[PDB]
Structure 1
Amino acid sequence: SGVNNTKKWKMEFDTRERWENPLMGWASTADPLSNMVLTFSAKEDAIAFAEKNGWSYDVEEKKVPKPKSKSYGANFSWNKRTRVSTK
C-alpha cells in the first residue's frame, strides 16, 4: 500500500531478447540497455534527456489516485445500500 515508489519519473528501454544458456540455463542477453533505468524529478526533464540522447520516447502521464469520499458512518446507514452486514 505504500506510495513512495510513485514519486519520481522513470525512463526505461524496450525489452530485448533473453534466451537460455545451453550450459546452465541462465538468462542470457545480447543488449546492454536491459537493466538501464533512469530517474528524473520531472517529465520535462526526462523529455529533455531523451531528446538530447536521441532516443525515441513514449510518455504516459502520472496516474494519480482519484480523491474518494470516505465516511465511517456510511457502514451503518438507515436506508442506503452502504450498510455492511459484518465487521
Structure 2
Amino acid sequence: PLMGWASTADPLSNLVLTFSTKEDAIAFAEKNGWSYDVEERKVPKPKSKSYGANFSWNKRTRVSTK
C-alpha cells in the first residue's frame, strides 16, 4: 500500500530446481516429502521438406511468391 510493489507471504515462491532426468526428478520429489505433479516431455516431430516439394508440377504445394 505504501509504494505499489508486489509483496507475498510465500517463502517457497521463487524456487526452481533444474534436474536432468525424470526418474531422479520423481525420486527426489518422493524423497523430500512434498506431493508432486508430472507433466510429460513433447518432442518436435520430424518432418519431410524440400525446395523441390515447394516447386512441384501438378501438386498444389506451390509457394507462388518467392
TM-score (normalised: structure 2): 0.92
**Displaced runs of 4+ in structure 1, greater than 2 A?**
none
Say how many residue pairs are matched.
66
Partners of 2:63 and 2:55 in 1: how far apart?
A: 7
Partners of 1:57 and 1:72 in 2: how far apart?
A: 46
- Give the C-alpha shift of residue 36 in structure 1: 0.6
Aligned residue number for residue 32 of structure 1: 11
Structure 2: 5+ residue stretches without partners: none
Write out aligned runs for 1:72-83 (5 A): 72-83=51-62
More strand by share: 1
Partners of 1:35 and 1:70 in 2: how far apart?
A: 42
- Give the C-alpha shift of residue 60 in structure 1: 1.2
- Give the C-alpha shift of residue 58 in structure 1: 0.8
- Structure 1 or 2, whichever has the larger Rg, is 2
- Give the C-alpha shift of residue 70 in structure 1: 1.3
How much is the aligned-residue C-alpha RMSD, in angstroms?
0.9
Ranked by relative contact order (alpha carbons within 8 Å, sequence separation 6 or more), the top structure is 1
TM-score (normalised: structure 1): 0.71
- Give the C-alpha shift of residue 72 in structure 1: 1.3
Identity %: 95
Structure 1: 5+ residue stretches without partners: 1-21
Q: Spell out, residue by residue over 1:9-40, the C-alpha distance to the aligned partner (whole angstroms, 9 max, x if none).
A: xxxxxxxxxxxxx0111111111111110010
